[PDB]
Design a protein around this ligand. Sequence first.
Ligand SMILES: Nc1ncnc2c1ncn2[C@@H]1O[C@H](COP(=O)(O)OP(=O)(O)O)[C@@H](O)[C@H]1O
Ligand SMILES: Nc1ncnc2c1ncn2[C@@H]1O[C@H](COP(=O)(O)OP(=O)(O)O)[C@@H](O)[C@H]1O
Ligand SMILES: [Cl-]
Ligand SMILES: [Cl-]
Ligand SMILES: [Cl-]
Ligand SMILES: [Cl-]
Ligand SMILES: [Cs+]
Ligand SMILES: [Cs+]
Ligand SMILES: [Mg+2]
Ligand SMILES: [Mg+2]
Ligand code: NA
Ligand code: NA
Ligand code: NA
Ligand code: NA
Lengths: 446, 446
Amino acid sequence: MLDKIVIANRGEIALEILRACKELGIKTVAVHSSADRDLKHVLLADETVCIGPAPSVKSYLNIPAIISAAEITGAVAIHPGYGFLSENANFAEQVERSGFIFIGPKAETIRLMGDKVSAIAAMKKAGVPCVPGSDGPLGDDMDKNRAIAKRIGYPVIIKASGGGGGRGMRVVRGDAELAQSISMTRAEAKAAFSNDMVYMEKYLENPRHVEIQVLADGQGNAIYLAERDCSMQRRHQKVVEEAPAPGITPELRRYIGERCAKACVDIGYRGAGTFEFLFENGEFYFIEMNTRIQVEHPVTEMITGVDLIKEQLRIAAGQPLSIKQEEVHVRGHAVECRINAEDPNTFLPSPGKITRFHAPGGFGVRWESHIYAGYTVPPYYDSMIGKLICYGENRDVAIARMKNALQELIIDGIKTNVDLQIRIMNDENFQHGGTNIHYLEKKLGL
Amino acid sequence: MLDKIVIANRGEIALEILRACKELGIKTVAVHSSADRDLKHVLLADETVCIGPAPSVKSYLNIPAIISAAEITGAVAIHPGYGFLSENANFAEQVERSGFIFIGPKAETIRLMGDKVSAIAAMKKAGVPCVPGSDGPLGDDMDKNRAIAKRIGYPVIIKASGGGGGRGMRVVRGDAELAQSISMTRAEAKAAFSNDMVYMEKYLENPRHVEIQVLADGQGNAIYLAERDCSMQRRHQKVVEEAPAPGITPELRRYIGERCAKACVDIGYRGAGTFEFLFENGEFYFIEMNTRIQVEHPVTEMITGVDLIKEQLRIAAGQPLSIKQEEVHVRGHAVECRINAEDPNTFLPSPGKITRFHAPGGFGVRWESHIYAGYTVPPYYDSMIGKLICYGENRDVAIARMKNALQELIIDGIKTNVDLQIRIMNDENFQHGGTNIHYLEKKLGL
Ligand SMILES: Nc1ncnc2c1ncn2[C@@H]1O[C@H](COP(=O)(O)OP(=O)(O)O)[C@@H](O)[C@H]1O
Ligand SMILES: Nc1ncnc2c1ncn2[C@@H]1O[C@H](COP(=O)(O)OP(=O)(O)O)[C@@H](O)[C@H]1O
Ligand SMILES: [Cl-]
Ligand SMILES: [Cl-]
Ligand SMILES: [Cl-]
Ligand SMILES: [Cl-]
Ligand SMILES: [Cs+]
Ligand SMILES: [Cs+]
Ligand SMILES: [Mg+2]
Ligand SMILES: [Mg+2]
Ligand code: NA
Ligand code: NA
Ligand code: NA
Ligand code: NA
């Protein structure tokens, strides 16, 4: 066990990490921007270090300051959570070169899987099925560019190799739009990711977003913890996540799961990670790996009994995996609704003061949030303000519970997506299950 | 199913009733004092009626106003929750005489079991074991009074027949103290309950407080849902409740459980109710029946899978019991900690403004409360401000979870018993389990 860790994050994930540390008897160090001084996770941590002013670049992305916090507190490890620096290889290597355990994969693995182009190359080599595409970056030869398109079949999607969070993606319907679409994706990617490498991928018109949770100890053992369906999306971002994926058979789970576990071993993967697939006409197609814990980790926890953050900590401590593959069982069903305060016109976090707040309760209802009545939501970070996760003995029970939980939830003073979430739960097509990644945008007329 | 009900209560129980109504598709009517206008349960109810000013006598105990609220909204039933008028037979008969279903026992049953003297008489007649005692009210014949004492054995306790909430009770160690102890209990009882009938009971020096949950449909069917141990007490009031009772065997459960189920039938009991026993040297001794839902109902729900409030509503609707005795199973363990804001000098609710509030989360952790950051706690009602209930696969897991949950809980600005609760969870004697009703007072030096 690690004696003391720095939690290099904020919000729900910092709260979840702190909870896991407490159960394992790990001393905690909270870093915060000056704006997050009074957040729940800061109050509850054993020690706190202010790591800079409000802007993320100055604080939560401030690598030297985070390392300093670790050194002055004498921590032995740093948990990056998700977002921020969690998939920053430079951060990972600095942490480890400064004599700290990085609670995540090796830096080289973050680089390998962090470049989406190279991630696909490694996956193909490993025997993991991928989306037909350019299999390498796109040049300026518009003849080979249109030929790749013909070989894979329109529509196609232009994707930023350094891309993330849904940004740096453009669909192309025909030859006529290809050249300019490639051009403004590169421009979009330069501006957002400081990397204008793009590739081409077949645009799948009827897939579900089905992702595989893995854990690997980096000592040769790797397991899959069933799957999640995250097909309810807007602007390529997830709104609702569930586990298990509706209608996925033990056969399909095992098929793709064992290929992911083998890929982990081939790449020397360490820690928690997720292989994201598009699933269409009975076939899985790898799109990317998230080399980190994910927002929606609790739905997997609910259906498997496996606390993924606890397992991150045991792995980081050097323990081999405490769970064998055949010990992983799927029981019941879980649904997560992300609660966001996003400006609907700009897609940016919506600042404001919460004037009235009440969290839902009851059996099978889990709420995770740093917000409280009188909280001022800052514009500096992301738009998620809470996570609502309901368990049921089956999917119908889980959805019904979620709907009731959402109607118990009170958040006044700021704009939220609570009303949208209730409408999704009441959606007949969602209730039947297996709706594809394109459904919500069409429903909403986007 | 009932179309619409009035929730004649406030706080946690009103929230729990509203939740149950929602799941069953029952329209809800919240009554409130003028002081409770913005409480969570008022906000969430379909309709709201202000039933009077802040003082309970003027509002929550205001029988005509509560009935009026039912008539103007066209409700078909009234749920009294616990406390207040829930064991007021006058209220029960007025509700039913005005053409509404009272969600509870028949008025005559409330009277029968509401007079503790007559409750004991009926229990003995029914074959339920009771504490040796005077078996009738105490007169002024101090010779027969000391003779009863000799027959049962000192120490003895003088108990108000109309008593409740821990008040109107006095221990007597010898003949020398008997006459005056009887005198000031009667006086205490006149002042508090407007009834100075007292009886004598053997004062049990090593019992656990073990109570049996029942449900009865009033159509001849009655089941017991295991037991709760509520031995952690101060001034005769419960601080911690758990289920099942540690070390109670299937044999002991069945023994006392079947006697309670038979008593229900003999008295024509209807709805949820609890038989409270003292358990000493392997023997159960009835002390009283609570003819209503209890605060600690969720620990039973957690270990049995039975939602007791849902079952109250189905029974009130005229449905026979939806559960057979052999279908009742005990799985895992649950512990509840009452969170109180009580003045430690006067034993009265402590008013104040909550300056910072954060509820605990995580697996197996349930929080029930109407409080929020910026809430002003009124002095008008009771001192409980929330209920924290943790589940575990066994008792050690449940206690460990509770301890962690209590340390995650933040309530600033007002005095609470959170620190006491943490200390109880850390108490080696509690951790071994089976501590008696006298333990906490001795621990605290009271
Ligand atoms: N080839 C594709 N066809 C159709 N939709 C896609 C494709 N690639 C990505 N998407 C959509 O964009 C989402 C995010 O894609 P991903 O590659 O994981 O980007 P990011 O790195 O921004 O998360 C997917 O869940 C899917 O809905
Ligand atoms: N005969 C007794 N011997 C010892 N303790 C008792 C006895 N009767 C009551 N008590 C204590 O007082 C508590 C409440 O008693 P009860 O009769 O249920 O009164 P109330 O109606 O106020 O709840 C019991 O849980 C027990 O701890
Ligand atoms: Cl992570
Ligand atoms: Cl569908
Ligand atoms: Cl009740
Ligand atoms: Cl003990
Ligand atoms: Cs990636
Ligand atoms: Cs009683
Ligand atoms: Mg992705
Ligand atoms: Mg009692
Ligand atoms: Na924000
Ligand atoms: Na609401
Ligand atoms: Na109060
Ligand atoms: Na605390």
